[PDB]
Amino acid sequence: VLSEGEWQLVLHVWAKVEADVAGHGQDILIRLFKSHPETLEKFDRFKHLKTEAEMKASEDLKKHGVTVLTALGAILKKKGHHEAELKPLAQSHATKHKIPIKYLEFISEAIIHVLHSRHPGDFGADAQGAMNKALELFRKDIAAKYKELGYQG
Numbered sequence: 001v002l003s004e005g006e007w008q009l010v011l012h013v014w015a016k017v018e019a020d021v022a023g024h025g026q027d028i029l030i031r032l033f034k035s036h037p038e039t040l041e042k043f044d045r046f047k048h049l050k051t052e053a054e055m056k057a058s059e060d061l062k063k064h065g066v067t068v069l070t071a072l073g074a075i076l077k078k079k080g081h082h083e084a085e086l087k088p089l090a091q092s093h094a095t096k097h098k099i100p101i102k103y104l105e106f107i108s109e110a111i112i113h114v115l116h117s118r119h120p121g122d123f124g125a126d127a128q129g130a131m132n133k134a135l136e137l138f139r140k141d142i143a144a145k146y147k148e149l150g151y152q153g
């Protein structure tokens, strides 16, 4: 469980992410799709994109970046009390999208890389540790829902 001091670090940087959700979304999806190409194959709507330049040019990709970050933001601001927000997400990602838990680990690492690139001053090692802990909590709760449904990972 994160302390109140650790949640503050998390939400202090997230308030900067929120100044430009779309640019953040874009960087994070592209980082993920380049680092772990197998993730790109889950998206019929993106599968055609072959280069980084094509990814950067895609308005639909940018739109879906905002979608993801806005959902994640709603969860982070619950400070761990995120039952109502998490449930629908695990359900669709386990059963409809077929997303292994391992990919949620990949996208976590993309989020931490981009926050460190864009926000060094607010994202020192103490902030990075807090954000890793929040993302682990997110992953741990989703994984429990997966298990229930028979999809664990």
Ligand code: HEM
Binding pocket: 039, 040, 042, 043, 044, 045, 067, 068, 069, 071, 072, 088, 089, 092, 093, 097, 099, 103, 104, 107, 108
């Ligand atoms: C930070 C974690 C993630 C969050 C907050 C998240 C959130 C969302 C949201 C809110 C939607 C739209 C509503 C829905 O269908 O449930 C969505 C759709 C989807 N997500 Fe995620 N997602 C996450 C991770 C991922 C990852 C890691 C992948 C694939 C590697 C994935 C695959 C998908 C797919 C295939 C769709 C449907 C897109 C479409 O065709 O419209 N998601 N996600």
